[PDB]
Design a protein around this ligand. Structure first.
Ligand SMILES: *[C@@H]1O[C@H](CO)[C@@H](O)[C@H](O)[C@H]1NC(C)=O
Ligand SMILES: *[C@@H]1O[C@H](CO)[C@@H](O)[C@H](O)[C@H]1NC(C)=O
Ligand SMILES: *[C@@H]1O[C@H](CO)[C@@H](O)[C@H](O)[C@H]1NC(C)=O
Ligand SMILES: *[C@H]1O[C@H](CO)[C@@H](O)[C@H](O)[C@H]1NC(C)=O
Ligand SMILES: *[C@H]1O[C@H](CO)[C@@H](O)[C@H](O)[C@H]1NC(C)=O
Ligand SMILES: *[C@H]1O[C@H](CO)[C@@H](O)[C@H](O)[C@H]1NC(C)=O
Lengths: 602, 602, 602
């Protein structure tokens, strides 16, 4: 037989692509606009100041006056320990004696005791029966923050056992300087020692402030004069006080200066100042980004309006800070674009944003550093937000630039494809379309022709490319450039008609193409999945396409997907270590004391 | 001389590429499959509920009964302060008197005192010698959370100084309503005032619970009846108690209701409900992602099984929550795909995951918001995990889409290269191969030919492109399209043979190509690193290649690498500020009290 | 009329591109070097150990000795409660009695009382007038951590009421074993019960340590011998102590062993060991990355030098750890490259970095896990830094690989463009240049020609492509391949001259191109914005270009920008829950006690 059965390819099947109906003009869109990568983020330049809620307590000095009687303690004169001796109890210093102490740094020698009947008792030191004055001495060298002055060095006093205990001849006056503290509501204040006064330190006659102590014990004086410190004695400097309060609670008299709440307590404290900041406006919130702090603060778009008297105490301070910061760095290149705005970030931080306009060419640069010692991390969330914002911005910029470059490359490739289609329209148009078709250049546009398949049987190729005359004479000057192939159209039609092989398993009828024969020729034709070798315009061998190696024209993209990660929880200090880190434990102390007291039922 | 020495290029050297052996067929792989970008992550739809460990203490009401004798305090009748007067001490109220108080809101007028010998003492109010009853009054208007009822207003009592102190005629009954608290083990409970009972509040006759107090002091009653509040007096409503406990500790009697531990303490508390959640399954753990909370919870793949009686108290609650959530949002578009699963996330959070199936087309949408006030941040790790997961997902999606587009572009470029190789095979195949070679189209496949170099000396180009006859006659109708070049093969062979210049410093022997001459001609030929100008088919000038400018065909990728960042540590509040934020300091109070007591050695 | 008005395109306008001046040689740069993506990060291999500051207090045993007298408590013999009976007060045990207790586990039966006058009182148990010894008993079964031994079981003592109170005949000796704690400065130590000693536990005769207690009360002994535990009695084992301290404070005597501060307190505690670590060196700091912990530690580039005696206590431990870790995993594949370095990371963590060199081929692999219970998260910042570093590294690697692939693709595209320009130079050079120009291949280089526009009026196309002889005879063998177009040059010159249409609205004069006529012909020519159809070399129709569809040659990049995210603040436990989580509240206890004491003014 002078024919060879052809192979088969599942995506380049043997098809006849005659013009049939033709038409179906096509063209390449060379009119493509590529947009430069403009960032969609809206950013504004400026600086902002951050204020935090003040958690420090309000500390003020409190002076306490106490007068007490005590028998000689731990007496053991008689056989039965003289029944001991102890008066111990004391009473609050009277107001006039407090005035004497605050004026001349001395205290009276006599006290009055009121029995429930109403009788007034007169007690004297050593029974001298004199209402004279005694000086005060700084016992224990005034210690630290608890400077107390005393008039009696606690010596041995008069006593005598009548087989019992009966003695009280020791007058001592206790004057102590202490400091008190109060939380934010100021409903009460407590001394450092432990005494508690259930009332507002700013309470007055009609201020309406909280006060639970009995009113009759309270006493308010105006334009009072008192010595600053008792160490200096009666010659110490005296400062006028516009309003002072005297309270008699229990056995002690408490005195403190009544100040004004609005002018003495500020509930906002300056935390930090960011000289170079940016405001990123999202669809619902602002993002204040500080590269120096690596922090991003999120606040709602509605600016605040500071009106509370306890929150306007920072107005002058932050206005001066704004003026100084603007005068220092952004003096020339920028100008203050409108007034500042006050925002409340999530997490309750007061942020004062000041916009800046313009950009001059260059501006002064300043650097700073801090050596603060780490103790905790309460605001790591702003760092998390900053990390997300920075990574998102970088990724968006990189991918936008990549998209612009991709647009440019695609436009150039489209132009190149249009230029190439004028030479080999069929392959280019088939590749772009994605389906094997036939196209032909009809002037300046491509006129494709959808065409049908034929049956895969009876696909025979003549093993001679020579042109043979009608009289069975080979023409030595005419040789077919492509092998002659015979096909049976569809299987429903057993008729067989001869054609010529084209490209990518394509057949075409008509005048078979031919050219001058060449004595040396080793043409190879691809058909289906079997290469055919033609030497001297005749078939010699037929081998599978897989035998001839493949040029590695593909360019790989060495990118691997990111892997899942489980951030494991880390504990620097075990809770046992936190338990052992405190010298004093309230629960342990109370439990031990209660157990000892219960065992003390003897 | 009629010749010019050629230049040199280090990567396009003058080589002779005769066929020699030929062979070495090559082809382009146009059969490339481009996989679309399918995400490898496995995600499931549903909602989950998160439960946290309950840290709240167990609070229950405790009633205390106390009976005490006190002489008129701070007596000062006689000269020696009448040796004062103070009985002070007290004793626990007897059980029958407690019953009388709890029933008729009144207390007996007589008490019994047991001396160590065994004698029983009878003491009476005002020595009336009557065992009658007295009512209780809400002293201090019952205050807040410490409503205490008393029977004596502490008036002046009978006394008389025989130069000593001897008086005790004041019977007072103290009945107080207080609240106690206990940690999780319930080994003990302590009153708010400070009293401690070393026993389980759920202790019973044989429950086996921890109890350190002596058993003889304990007393357990059943079906006890008692008044709810003492403010209402004897007419107050009474509630039956199935089991009550009476404990006599020190000088006070404590009473509390014995409940059931399993039915009164729940160790898991509902935290939040996520209506729209996703479960990302990794190779070892599940990731529960909530976009609303911006949180990701990591739990092991093994579902739990709630069996502890103190942890099953949430079963009905969370089942009802599941039913309500499913009935509200996912009523129609989804159906409950199997039963729920319970997972324990890292960090000990109980997560109840409910799967959902299907997707109907649309579902109801609901929005919510919260105005909770920030105080701390204990679970920032879930936000960190969510941030990592979100960024990883976005990066993976973007790079997968980029890889798919790159595959498509590379496939089209390979097709274009195959089409181009049919016109200029040498350059295309050399570029793909990466090494300068020669190729020729042998029908439908390329037959490349590896070829060797020649010596770089004696590379001379004739300065005339005209074809000169054997008789020294220039042919005005035939002119060489390329300059004639002479080379000496390798330096080991000094013989010189004339050839014709090709492309990219390539030489070829044989019949030199020629065409019709043209009077106007300004052809320029590139050879080595020196362009040669040929006007009228003769050499005129020779200039370096760098003189002629270069088209900027390269398309840049404006991408810069990310920079290193050092997240600096931020401290909102200095540790000194934390120290100053507390009104009461245990260490300072104890140190001051101890110093004062040590100085009280008088 | 035999002419049709042409259309117009705003970017491909009708221009005449005659050679004019020519020149302007151009070429393609095929000499492009691409770079394999080499990472710029500098990483070193090794392992490091992390040490944290020790927050645990220093606990040591303290023995207390107390001797007290107490009358029979709660006496009620006589009618007036026998005026009660209470001596109660006590005194510090003398040093010699302490020696007797510490040696023979027994205490003397007599004590001495010194009155302020100077007299010495002799008191005895039951008035036996014997200075004998008594044993100690472990009261309350020694409890836990408060083992106390007593000699008196607190029985009834001798007493008698003479209408008053007079009795003291109960000698009791209190010996207690307690534990004390101290913070870092060691300025003071406090017992667990609550007693405070204002002095350094390491104080000595001349150590210079802080000590506020009076020196005369202190007593230091050397080579002291004492029983370890009092439970064993007089037969208990005794351990020599090189130095012991006896302090008499108040009514109690305190004894503790004086150790050496340098050899007993270590201020650095081992936290974790990272067997596989990496050190990333930035421009200013090192980054120590541990994949196992998912943590990155940032430290300055200057290595420390441990010299403090209280910080060198870890030297041997961490050197042994280094040796063991190297011997275990990196025994063969790696060698210790130099000595270790000590860094102080931000956050005050001591990091001991050990470099490793080489890589052998494979090394042993070991895995570990921990089941620690979560209680807090203090070091989340290292996890944040690790997350940033990991994401930055991955993004940099991916984008570098993408850049390298882009370089390769661009180089191949440039080669392809150079090959294509030899066929259709005008379109390729115009696309690369970005502006419509004309180019022509002058041998091996392109000689472009900048050319000017012409007026958009009088652009007429002849509706016949047939070549007509000068005698008005159509040539059936010659037909123009392109339509003949007439233009009026610029509008300032109304003269009209006929030309031939080219490509992309280009005109050219000279000998109009022509070829053999074909009976079937349906050529379509694009001009301006109107396609023209030519059948049988004559015009038939003119339609807009938008009518013919467009091949979708563009390849999209399905990438969408990342969206802004607001990480909302999450609170696991409300501050009210933190308030309710404590059984004991110092503020509430103090307020209630103070209110009760104030109401106790009776
Ligand atoms: C002094 O105080 C009185 C109120 O006690 C006040 O009325 C008066 O204006 C004050 N004068 C000065 C100078 O402060
Ligand atoms: C009442 O309490 C007793 C136990 O004291 C119990 O046996 C009885 O069943 C209870 N009856 C009711 C109705 O509660
Ligand atoms: C015993 O202690 C004394 C100091 O009291 C010291 O001088 C002596 O060297 C010590 N000897 C031994 C063996 O410890
Ligand atoms: C706040 O009050 C000021 C006047 O003190 C007013 O000018 C401003 O518009 C107010 N802003 C808001 C939000 O109420
Ligand atoms: C838990 O117990 C239940 C029965 O109460 C059983 O059905 C389930 O399989 C058990 N699961 C595990 C992990 O033990
Ligand atoms: C620290 O001291 C050691 C000697 O003990 C010395 O060798 C080293 O160079 C010193 N390093 C620094 C930073 O001072």
């Amino acid at each position: 037989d002078d024919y060879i059965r052809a192979g088969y390819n599942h995506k380049y099947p043997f098809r006849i692509c005659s013009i049939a109906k033709g038409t179906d003009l096509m063209r390449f869109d060379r009119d493509i606009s590529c947009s430069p990568y403009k960032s969609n983020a809206k950013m504004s330049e400026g600086f902002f100041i951050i204020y935090k809620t003040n958690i420090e307590t309000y500390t003020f000095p409190v002076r306490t006056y106490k007068n007490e009687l005590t028998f000689p303690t731990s007496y053991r004169d008689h056989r039965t320990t003289y029944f001991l001796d102890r008066t111990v109890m004391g009473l609050a210093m009277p107001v006039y004696e407090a005035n004497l102490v605050n004026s001349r740094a001395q205290c009276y020698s006599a006290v009055a005791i009121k029995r429930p009947d109403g009788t007034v008792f007169s007690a004297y030191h050593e029974d001298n029966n004199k209402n004279e004055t005694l000086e005060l001495f700084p016992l224990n060298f005034k210690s630290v923050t608890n400077k107390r002055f005393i008039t009696t060095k606690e010596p041995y006093f008069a006593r005598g056992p009548l087989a019992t205990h009966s003695t009280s001849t020791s007058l001592n006056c206790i004057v102590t300087e202490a400091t008190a503290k109060a939380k934010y509501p100021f409903s009460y204040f407590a001394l450092t020692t432990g005494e508690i006064v259930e009332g507002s330190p700013f309470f007055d006659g009609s201020n309406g402030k909280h006060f639970a102590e009995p009113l009759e014990k309270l006493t308010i004086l105006e334009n009072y004069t008192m010595i600053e410190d008792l160490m200096n004695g009666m010659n110490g400097a005296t400062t006028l006080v516009r309003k002072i309060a005297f309270l008699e609670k229990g056995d002690t008299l408490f005195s403190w200066e009544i100040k004004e709440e609005n002018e003495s307590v500020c509930m906002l404290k300056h935390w930090t100042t960011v000289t170079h900041g940016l405001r990123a406006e999202t669809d619902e919130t602002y993002h204040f980004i500080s590269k120096e702090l690596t922090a991003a603060f999120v606040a709602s778009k509605e600016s605040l309006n500071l009106t509370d008297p306890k929150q306007t105490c920072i107005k002058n301070e932050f206005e001066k800070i704004i003026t100084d910061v603007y005068m220092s760095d952004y003096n020339d290149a920028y100008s203050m674009n409108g007034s500042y705005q006050i925002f409340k970030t999530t997490g309750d931080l007061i942020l004062i944003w000041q916009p800046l306009v313009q950009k001059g060419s260059v501006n002064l640069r300043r650097r700073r550093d801090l050596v603060d010692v780490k103790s905790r991390h309460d605001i790591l969330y702003v760092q998390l937000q900053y990390l997300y914002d920075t990574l998102k911005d970088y990724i968006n910029d990189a991918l936008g630039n990549l998209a612009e470059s991709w647009c440019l490359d695609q436009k150039r490739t489209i132009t190149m494809l249009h230029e190439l289609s004028k030479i080999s329209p069929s392959s280019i148009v088939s590749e772009v379309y994605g389906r094997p078709i036939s196209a032909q250049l009809h002037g300046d546009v491509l006129a494709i022709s959808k065409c049908i398949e034929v049956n895969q049987s009876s696909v025979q190729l003549y093993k001679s490319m020579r042109v043979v005359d009608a009289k069975g004479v080979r023409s030595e000057t005419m040789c077919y450039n492509r092998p002659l192939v015979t096909f049976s159209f569809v299987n429903s039609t057993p008729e067989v008609v001869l054609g010529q092989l084209g490209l990518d398993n394509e057949i075409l009828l008509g005048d078979h193409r031919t050219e001058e024969c060449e004595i040396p020729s080793t043409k190879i034709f691809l058909s289906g999945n079997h290469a055919h070798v033609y030497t001297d315009y005749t078939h010699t061998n037929s081998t599978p396409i897989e035998d001839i190696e493949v040029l590695d024209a593909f360019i790989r993209l060495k990118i691997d997907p990111l892997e899942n990660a489980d951030f494991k929880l880390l504990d620097l200090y075990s809770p046992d270590e936190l338990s052992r880190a405190n010298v004093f434990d309230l629960e342990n102390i109370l439990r031990e004391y209660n157990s000892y007291k219960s065992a003390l039922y003897t």
